[PDB]
Structure formats: C-alpha cells, structure tokens
Amino acid sequence: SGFRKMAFPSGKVEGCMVQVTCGTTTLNGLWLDDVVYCPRHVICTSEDMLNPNYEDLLIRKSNHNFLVQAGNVQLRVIGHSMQNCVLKLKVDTANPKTPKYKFVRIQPGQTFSVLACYNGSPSGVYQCAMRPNFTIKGSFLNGSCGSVGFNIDYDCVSFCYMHHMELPTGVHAGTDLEGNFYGPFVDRQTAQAAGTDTTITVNVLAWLYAAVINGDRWFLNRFTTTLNDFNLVAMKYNYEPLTQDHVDILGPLSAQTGIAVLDMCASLKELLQNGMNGRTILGSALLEDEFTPFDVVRQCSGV
Amino acid sequence: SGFRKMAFPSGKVEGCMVQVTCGTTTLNGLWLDDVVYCPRHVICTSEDMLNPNYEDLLIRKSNHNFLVQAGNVQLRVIGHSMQNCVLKLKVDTANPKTPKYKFVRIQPGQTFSVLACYNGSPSGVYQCAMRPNFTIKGSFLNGSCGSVGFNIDYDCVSFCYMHHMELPTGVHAGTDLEGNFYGPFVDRQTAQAAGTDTTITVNVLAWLYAAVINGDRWFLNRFTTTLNDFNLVAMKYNYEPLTQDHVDILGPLSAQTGIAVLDMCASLKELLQNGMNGRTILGSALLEDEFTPFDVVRQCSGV
Numbered sequence: 281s282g283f284r285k286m287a288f289p290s291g292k293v294e295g296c297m298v299q300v301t302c303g304t305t306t307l308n309g310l311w312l313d314d315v316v317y318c319p320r321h322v323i324c325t326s327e328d329m330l331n332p333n334y335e336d337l338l339i340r341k342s343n344h345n346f347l348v349q350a351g352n353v354q355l356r357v358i359g360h361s362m363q364n365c366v367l368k369l370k371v372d373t374a375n376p377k378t379p380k381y382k383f384v385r386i387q388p389g390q391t392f393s394v395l396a397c398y399n400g401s402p403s404g405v406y407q408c409a410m411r412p413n414f415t416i417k418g419s420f421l422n423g424s425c426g427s428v429g430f431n432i433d434y435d436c437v438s439f440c441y442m443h444h445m446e447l448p449t450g451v452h453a454g455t456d457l458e459g460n461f462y463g464p465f466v467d468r469q470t471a472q473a474a475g476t477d478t479t480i481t482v483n484v485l486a487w488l489y490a491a492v493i494n495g496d497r498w499f500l501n502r503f504t505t506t507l508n509d510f511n512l513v514a515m516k517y518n519y520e521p522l523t524q525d526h527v528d529i530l531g532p533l534s535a536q537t538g539i540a541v542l543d544m545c546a547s548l549k550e551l552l553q554n555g556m557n558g559r560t561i562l563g564s565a566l567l568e569d570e571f572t573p574f575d576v577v578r579q580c581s582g583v
Numbered sequence: 584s585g586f587r588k589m590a591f592p593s594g595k596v597e598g599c600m601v602q603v604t605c606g607t608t609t610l611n612g613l614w615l616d617d618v619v620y621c622p623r624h625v626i627c628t629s630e631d632m633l634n635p636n637y638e639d640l641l642i643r644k645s646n647h648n649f650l651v652q653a654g655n656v657q658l659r660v661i662g663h664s665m666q667n668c669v670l671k672l673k674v675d676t677a678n679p680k681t682p683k684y685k686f687v688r689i690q691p692g693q694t695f696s697v698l699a700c701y702n703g704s705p706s707g708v709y710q711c712a713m714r715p716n717f718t719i720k721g722s723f724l725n726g727s728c729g730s731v732g733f734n735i736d737y738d739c740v741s742f743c744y745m746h747h748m749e750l751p752t753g754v755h756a757g758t759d760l761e762g763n764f765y766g767p768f769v770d771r772q773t774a775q776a777a778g779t780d781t782t783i784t785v786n787v788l789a790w791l792y793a794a795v796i797n798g799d800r801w802f803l804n805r806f807t808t809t810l811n812d813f814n815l816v817a818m819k820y821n822y823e824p825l826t827q828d829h830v831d832i833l834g835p836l837s838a839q840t841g842i843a844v845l846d847m848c849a850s851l852k853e854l855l856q857n858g859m860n861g862r863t864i865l866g867s868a869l870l871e872d873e874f875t876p877f878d879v880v881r882q883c884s885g886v
C-alpha cells in the first residue's frame with residue numbers, strides 16, 4: 281500500500297556525471313562512451329548572453345579551453361562539436377560506467393526522474409513531468425545546468441532532458457540529448473515566458489485509479505458520462521481533451537478496479553464542479569496530474 | 584527556484600542490495616563488508632507467523648538454509664546471528680561496493696530516502712518522514728521487506744530504517760539497522776494498529792520558509808504571537824508542541840527571509856483557523872509536514 285512521487289534509482293546516471301569548466305563558467309556534463317554532453321551556453325562570457333552567435337563563439341575555442349573532471353580524474357578533451365544547443369566534447373577515455381542507454385524525446389504529460397547535480401556531483405533525485413507548455417516544475421539552483429532527466433526500462437537508461445535555464449515564473453526549460461529545446465525557448469537572456477498551461481487529464485484519471493487501488497473511494501459515484509460531455513467540462517476547467525487513445529491506455533487500471541473509464545470521468549466532473557469539501561485523495565487536497573498510467577501500474581499493487 | 588520531494592542519490596545503496604531466500608520466502612538484504620542484514624521474519628513458514636519463537640526457529644536453521652544472491656553472484660553464508668529483529672548472515676565475500684556508512688536511529692519528524700527493492704533489485708527511490716506515531720507513509724508491496732531508508736552526509740551513508748511490515752491503515756513499520764523497532768510494533772501477525780498521529784509543527788514552519796524563499800508570500804501578516812499562545816492553537820489542531828529548541832533550529836531560515844519565527848507562527852495560526860481560501864503554497868493545498876529545516880536549507884537558494 282501507499283503512493284509516493286517515486287524516482288528511478290539514480291546509480292546508473294550518477295556514474296555518468298562530470299564537471300565541465302570553460303573560462304569562469306562551471307556546469308555539469310553527461311559522460312557516455314568517449315563523449316561528454318553539456319549545454320552549449322558553457323562557452324558564453326556573461327555580457328554576450330543577450331544575443332550570442334554560438335558558431336562564432338565555438339570557432340574561437342580549442343580543446344584545451346575545456347576542463348573536464350570525473351571526480352578527481354582529469355579527462356583530456358580531444359575534440360569539440362556543436363549539435364543544436366548541446367556541446368559534444370570527445371575525450372581520451374571511454375566511461376567504464378557507461379550504462380545501456382538511449383536518447384529519447386518525451387511528450388508533454390510524460391514523467392521522468394531528475395538527478396540534480398552541482399560541480400559534477402549528484403545532490404538529489406526527484407520526479408518531474410513535461411508540462412503541456414513544455415516547461416518542467418523542477419528544483420534547480422545556480423550551477424545545475426547539464427543535470428539530466430531519464431527513465432529506466434530493464435537495464436537501459438532512456439535520457440530525455442538536459443537542464444539549460446530558468447524562466448521568470450521559476451519553472452525550467454531544457455533540451456533533449458540531441459540538443460533540441462522542449463518548447464518555444466532559446467538559450468539566451470530574452471523576455472521569454474512560460475506559455476499558458478493546462479492540467480493533464482489522463483494523468484489525473486490514472487491517479488484517481490491509484491487512489492481506488494489504495495482504498496480511497498469517497499469520490500466514486502453510480503453516474504457515467506459520454507466522452508463528448510466530459511470534454512465540454514474539461515475545456516471549462518483548463519484540462520487537456522481526453523481521447524479514445526487515453527481511454528484505451530486507462531484500460532488495464534479500469535479492468536483491475538472494475539471502474540469503467542467514463543464512470544471515473546463522471547467522478548472527475550463532480551470533483552471539478554464541487555471540489556473535495558475539505559477531504560483528501562492519496563494525501564493531496566488537489567487533483568494531481570504528474571503520475572502517468574505507467575507510473576501508477578509501476579508502483580501500485582496488481583490486485 | 585522550485586521545491587520537490589528530493590531523495591538522496593541512491594547509487595551507494597543500490598550496490599549494497601541482495602536477494603535472501605530461506606525455504607519458500609524471498610526478501611531483500613543489505614550487504615556491507617562481509618555481513619548481510621535482513622528482517623528475521625525470513626525464517627518464518629507462514630502458519631507460525633501468529634506467535635513465532637524466533638530463538639527456536641533460528642536454532643533449527645544452518646548456513647546452507649540461506650541462499651544469498653548479489654545479482655547473479657552466489658554469496659556462501661559462513662555464519663548466522665540474530666540481533667533483535669534482524670538476521671546477520673556472515674558471507675565469504677566482503678562487498679567491494681561497501682560505502683562509508685553508519686547505523687543511526689532517527690527521531691520522529693526526521694526525513695530519509697527509501698530505496699524500494701524487490702528480489703534484491705532496486706525499483707525506486709522516494710522521501711519519507713518518521714511520523715510522531717513511529718510509522719512511515721511508505722510505498723511498499725509484497726517482497727519489499729529488507730528495503731532500507733538512509734540519509735547521505737558528504738560520502739557517508741547513514742542507514743536509519745529497514746522495512747518489516749504493513750499495518751491495517753496501509754502505513755509501514757520497521758526497525759533501525761540494529762533490529763530495534765520504531766514504535767510499539769512487533770514482527771508477527773497481531774491486531775496491532777498505528778497509534779493516533781499529530782502534525783510535525785517545526786516542519787510545517789520550515790516549509791512556509793521554503794515557500795517565502797520561492798516567492799509565495801500571500802499567507803504572511805504583520806501580526807506576531809507568543810510561543811505559549813501559538814502552542815494553545817497547536818494543541819487544538821493536533822499539531823506537536825513548538826519548543827525554544829525548534830525556534831533556534833529555524834534561526835537560519837528566519838535570518839535569510841527576515842521573518843521572525845513567532846511572526847511565521849502567527850501566519851500558521853491564521854492558516855489553521857481560516858484555511859487557504861482555495862489558494863496553494865509550493866503547489867500544495869494542505870500544510871506539508873515532511874520537510875525538515877535541514878531539507879529546506881539543503882534544497883533552497885541561500886539568497
């Protein structure tokens with residue numbers, strides 16, 4: 281029993297984290313085989329972070345300008361390349377701790393574990409979701425750039441996020457490991473701001489199924505709704521549309537609890553219209569949207 | 584910016600986890616130097632879990648009855664000992680991945696990271712608090728026994744919890760690594776139940792300081808209170824008494840925000856008497872009590 285924000289064990293990623301220093305700037309890099317991946321903004325001075333030309337800044341650098349440290353061990357840079365918003369530093373040593381890995385780009389509404397790192401040293405691990413507006417509600421301070429987000433499938437680390445920057449509302453923006461930003465954000469100081477966000481409806485429904493599996497049933501009702509009528513309510517409360525594909529993804533949790541998806545939709549409609557009336561679900565007084573159907577199945581009992 | 588339930592990186596503990604099998608029962612063990620620590624209830628059949636005599640059950644066992652596996656590698660048991668509610672299995676191989684470690688017992692209100700394990704394989708990491716009633720609101724299924732709780736200070740793993748059992752309300756009970764239960768619980772099937780619980784007042788105040796550091800200020804007021812008058816309100820709402828020692832522990836967060844502790848106590852009194860009026864603090868619609876002052880300083884900006 282119980283239900284927590286549960287990260288993947290971080291060991292396989294801790295062994296890949298390094299310190300990257302260029303001039304006065306230090307941040308984190310990801311060391312896989314003989315390549316160190318880090319945010320390209322490591323090559324910026326400070327005054328030129330308003331409108332940098334990164335192609336001009338990189339051509340002015342040589343391998344010796346980059347200091348890479350795996351704990352105490354110095355990794356000599358033998359090549360440098362820009363790929364979109366990431367730097368690829370070829371090093372003389374293949375990481376002996378390189379896990380089986382993939383670079384995957386995630387969808388808004390998908391979750392991942394973040395290993396927050398400072399000076400190439402892991403400090404903590406937490407769960408995050410990619411918001412519909414392509415921001416993440418992370419926990420990051422000065423020096424956290426190059427911290428990575430990941431999922432683990434069997435022995436294989438699927439890297440999905442590298443941390444680049446903070447937006448004015450205190451939410452975070454970054455790239456996939458191919459250096460392509462999530463969302464309409466750029467790696468320079470502008471007036472850029474998080475767009476309007478919505479609540480991830482399929483995740484709220486997954487979390488109500490987690491609650492039922494864990495014995496919170498007070499929000500259940502005899503009523504059902506149509507998908508169309510539910511989506512009218514979703515639109516009114518700034519919730520994402522629910523698709524038939526979402527209804528199918530909730531099939532296993534529906535089967536396990538014996539609560540039809542459209543019956544659970546009727547419960548969510550009542551929670552949106554009425555609130556909780558001072559009650560809680562899985563120790564929350566609000567409708568939680570950062571657990572996927574996968575996260576619920578991963579963590580919850582099979583009975 | 585931001586504020587998450589942040590666990591310690593789990594790598595140092597992942598390398599210590601093993602599978603322990605005795606007859607038909609499999610659970611997890613902790614492999615440090617040449618000793619594997621696990622719950623003594625691994626030696627129970629099933630019928631005799633109502634009123635086991637563990638001294639009688641253990642004297643009937645030999646080293647060959649215990650199968651210990653570190654992944655694929657078989658660890659031959661060369662000795663067995665009972666220490667309170669834990670079994671100490673001496674093995675022929677010292678764990679080459681043994682971190683610097685201590686066995687520490689924690690206080691109610693203290694937090695720790697849990698590495699949830701099944702069949703000696705880590706599945707996930709999350710933050711927990713020791714409740715005032717000496718239960719933990721964990722997330723554990725069949726086979727999770729021997730999962731451990733820990734804190735990390737520099738390079739040193741402070742092990743504080745081993746998982747033994749679930750109580751009827753779905754909360755969890757276990758021991759320190761010397762095998763001494765937290766709270767009035769026993770490792771056998773009885774009618775035992777979690778005692779009445781209270782809210783950890785010093786942690787709620789730490790979390791309000793985290794909110795102010797992160798720019799949630801709506802709950803602040805010009806008012807102050809006395810420690811005595813606050814503690815009358817605390818008693819009414821089933822909150823733990825606040826001591827002068829707690830006020831001193833909140834000194835650094837008070838200094839950083841410029842909000843006197845007794846001013847923050849006046850804010851908490853108003854939140855208890857009025858509620859939030861449909862507003863949120865650090866993305867919660869309730870008063871969070873599983874962040875210590877240490878957790879807030881560990882995670883939050885120093886400015």
Ligand SMILES: CNC(=O)[C@@H](Cc1ccc(Cl)cc1)N(C)C(=O)C[C@H]1CCCN1C(=O)c1cncc2ccccc12
Nearest residue numbers: 321420421422423424444445446447448467468469584
């Ligand atoms: C409100 N912040 C901003 O608007 C933007 C502006 C900007 C955008 C893109 C670039 Cl490339 C540079 C500047 N700023 C200042 C950052 O993102 C700081 C980032 C990028 C440069 C290092 N850096 C960080 O170490 C950093 C990362 N995570 C959270 C933080 C919280 C506190 C302090 C620093 C951080």
Ligand SMILES: CNC(=O)[C@@H](Cc1ccc(Cl)cc1)N(C)C(=O)C[C@H]1CCCN1C(=O)c1cncc2ccccc12
Nearest residue numbers: 281624723724725726727747748749750751770771772
């Ligand atoms: C409601 N549960 C109970 O009352 C008690 C009774 C009891 C107390 C002490 C002992 Cl030594 C044995 C039985 N039970 C059945 C457990 O704690 C199960 C524990 C102890 C024996 C294995 N075990 C688990 O693998 C287990 C652990 N964590 C959460 C679980 C959730 C689901 C299933 C199993 C677990």
